[PDB]
Symmetry: D2
């Protein structure tokens, strides 16, 4: 709109934008990179159709957003530790990775700031990714509700994904993309604010997710359950979401602090493979 | 035990006490009155079996607790505007008065401080009254949850009892004990703190009830519902309750700021009649 | 793929398809019509980008699906009582029409079978419509849960939209697209099965929606709320939805028996105008 | 009332009765035993104040109700395997036994029919036992709701009490009354009807409890959770309960099929000791 070096097409009135008119196989001039970063901060999830980039170009483009660092759970392609896989063979019957709303690796003291995902080979239909804005979840709380919860922190851990709760369950991820982890690493706790300030935009976002949040720190289990449940229902209303469909060589970047996302498992029996590099963040803070 | 002019038998480890060794038809000396008042403050609901008092002695004893003032909704006995009736004819099929956890007349800017209820004729069994302590409901919230809610206020009105919500439904009280009221008086709102300090003991109590609380002030309807539902489920756990069985001429006093009570409707087809005088309070405050 | 006279691009693995290779301004031969109808039955919501049709061609094409009959609540365009408007002026501050999951006019003894909606002028982004499959909501109930509910009926009425519950609240639709209605018509109840069989495909679908369903027939209010809340949370999981973005002259048909839909209100301050003709149905049945 | 050999004083209009005018240290003539059994079947929980019986008289009186057989979890007094203890030392800080609504040992293929509990040494106040009627929970379901759930079965196991869920938790029972159990015995599942017919009275009772019920058989976890939650809330309404206060040598009998009960933990710091013998039952059936 204001953009002169890239073409940007917002996806909904809440978040998401398609970006075209740029070739990510080539270096970006300063002005072009500035518009891309501005679109990233405005729209929170941006995607570029039709970008046939090499793995190393994927690494370098990811590096423009900040330091790259893989997440603990995913396997990487041979010869690139930074390039992890979200790969599901046609014949799998295991749990689909990321099939509840979450944001990535929040059990870390410093979760990722962003992730850059690229479609290698995906079905003609099925396997969309949903996103939602945690800026919008926060802004649509009343001032009274905001003031009530803004001093709270939450305890996060990977116990349901690769810790003792996981090991107690029957339903596994396959070993196609997921590593065997140490149970104790799965159960290690960290604490983050329930309401964070984005370190670049200064905007505030609600920060909780059902995959990694165990409870509100200092609360009883029943108090915490009641509050977190309301927040999850509030944040995942359909009005705050968008939905991204993938095609081969679509490159997408999401902000891992101010958004949540989830896989859509509607392609059972079909091969699906995307790669991703993760961009490191600093300690979430209030 | 520490009591030397009255005999006090606590009812549970949470609230409630029977008081004997005293004849309420006779004046009470300062020593005996000081212990009764102390037992009222410690136990929150106190009752005196076997007190065959006149209506005037009921008014005079009620007056020892504070100025007496009837509640808006109840009919009074002929010749005593201060002595109101909780009366249900055997064959009534209407709603049972007070059959949800509440405390009285909290839609008033200044609800009653206490009520003094006396059994005239009651069933051999059935018609007990439940009580619970809102001191205990407050004290068993975590320090974190207490800090989270202590600054909130709640909007109260009588809309479901004698205002527009009542008029919209089809389940009525009979005219045995309940007056016809103005709908606009039913709908008038007041605001009270969600957490109050008792003006005599200085102790804090949770202050919300599903009968008169409409919503948390300043919150959205979904936010208010979520928090108030948790607080009602928390406060009405069986562990925080006691149950009083009535016998003819039992006289009982409850603190209308720090308890809630409810009628038990398990005597359909049997006559029940109690009288009560209400003791005025000041504006609930933090 | 099996389609040889139209090109069909399914939208997700659950429901929804784009149809191209056809010009709806021209008559359709039997072969092309049979495939369109087949795609409508398989995919439940179908849409045709780029169809600059007249209002008469919109009526004629709608008529191929079944007899056309407007819904009670919407204003129609001058000169075409069958062509109703979903129109929102940029500066409206009123409630957004259809902004909760529902299916249309289910308070009728015989709700519509289908609707055909056409974009006249819509925002560059914002104003998408969500859809979900009630075939999928039904199929993913366990066999045990299916047997448990299949004999139940639900009482429907328009009370919250244009009856006494609507009149009691303070959030209105504007008069741009919505007629003034009789309150007694708003409150009139009908009964439908909770689980219906589609009269053409023979497949079964869950049939309840929070906008028009009042309660499960024969149940208490607390029993009905409990079951209907579970079914709404089950049916509206993100996995069962698809999301359609509009562009000028996109024409879309949805099956009003086996889907639910909702408006997304993310375009406040921007003009939006679609027209629709509704296709009459028969009484929903087991 | 009709009783001529015993004096019976019902406790509420729902369940419970005090029985006097009999000495349980002596054998009962046929007529006296017939009235006691009739009062047991009518009132579901009966209690006899002031019965200073020996352990063997307790055994023999229990034997009149049917075969005696201890429950798996509780320690017994030396020299009487049939006489188990519910004993809590003044200094305990562990979990209170039986502090949620339940009925006993329903993880067994044939749970107890009844239990006979006798106060040895109890506090002056605190440590009441609540009871409720599952006949009343069932009768207050609508016919429609009754027909909906009457064919369902439920899976029960002791996993939360002495199985893997217990071992996962932090909060233990003390070893004062509770035995060390095998985890596998804790996790063994059985199936009972959700609605049972009492084998003597022929009356129907709802049969589920949060302590031992894992899920509705054949349902998904979310479907089962939703239904069981509603039933627990419905059954434990205060209106369906009574509350029994203990005094030394009170002997009480409860029907373990048609009632639920729970301990009240309001006596922290005070010694409490009751003994009990359990009477074996047959397989719950519909
Ligand atoms: C890769 C990603 O891992 C998951 C996130 C959510 C869920 Cl449900 C499962 C996994 Cl493995 C992450 O958290 O970084
Ligand atoms: C007497 C009492 O009135 C009621 C309280 C609760 C309920 Cl559910 C009904 C009434 Cl009339 C009061 O609030 O003063
Ligand atoms: C046009 C449509 O009307 C509505 C549907 C849902 C809602 Cl929330 C509002 C309206 Cl006016 C209908 O039911 O036919
Ligand atoms: C003795 C009794 O055991 C319990 C019942 C409920 C609860 Cl919460 C705990 C126990 Cl040990 C039983 O089930 O037979
Ligand atoms: O497969 C997808 O769409 C998303 C998976 C995901 O959550 C992730 O990669 O962290
Ligand atoms: O009838 C009872 O037990 C209590 C009635 C009541 O709530 C009241 O008098 O305010
Ligand atoms: O405006 C929309 O997207 C849908 C409106 C709707 O629900 C309807 O026309 O019935
Ligand atoms: O201690 C009590 O009041 C009851 C304990 C109990 O549930 C039991 O003995 O099975
Ligand atoms: Cl390269
Ligand atoms: Cl006065
Ligand atoms: Cl027609
Ligand atoms: Cl003996
Ligand atoms: Co993820
Ligand atoms: Co009252
Ligand atoms: Co609609
Ligand atoms: Co027990």
């Amino acid at each position: 709109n204001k953009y002169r070096f890239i073409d940007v097409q917002p996806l909904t009135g809440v978040l998401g934008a398609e970006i075209t008119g740029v070739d990510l196989r080539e270096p970006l001039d300063d002005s072009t990179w500035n518009e891309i970063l501005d679109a990233f901060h405005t729209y929170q999830v941006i995607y570029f159709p039709g970008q046939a980039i090499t793995n190393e170009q994927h690494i370098a483009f990811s590096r423009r957003f900040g330091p790259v660092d893989p997440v603990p759970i995913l396997k990487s392609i041979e010869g690139y530790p930074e390039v992890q896989m979200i790969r599901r063979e046609a014949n799998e019957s295991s749990r689909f990775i990321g099939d509840d709303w979450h944001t990535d690796s929040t059990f870390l003291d410093a979760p990722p700031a962003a992730v850059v995902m690229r479609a290698i080979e995906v079905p003609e239909y099925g396997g969309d990714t949903g996103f939602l804005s945690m800026y919008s979840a926060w802004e649509t709380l009343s001032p009274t509700m905001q003031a009530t919860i803004e001093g709270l922190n939450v305890v996060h851990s990977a116990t349901k994904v690769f810790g003792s709760l996981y090991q107690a369950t029957n339903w596994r991820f396959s070993n196609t993309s997921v590593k065997v982890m140490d149970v104790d690493a799965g159960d290690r706790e960290t604490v983050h604010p329930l309401v964070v300030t984005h370190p670049v935009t200064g905007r505030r976002a609600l920060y909780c997710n059902q995959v990694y949040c165990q409870k509100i720190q200092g609360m009883t289990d029943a108090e915490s359950k009641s509050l977190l449940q309301f927040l999850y229902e509030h944040a995942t209303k359909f009005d705050f979401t968008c939905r991204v469909r993938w095609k081969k060589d679509q490159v997408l970047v999401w902000d891992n602090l101010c958004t949540m996302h989830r896989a859509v498992p509607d392609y059972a029996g079909k091969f699906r493979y995307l790669t991703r590099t993760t961009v490191a963040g600093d300690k979430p803070s209030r």
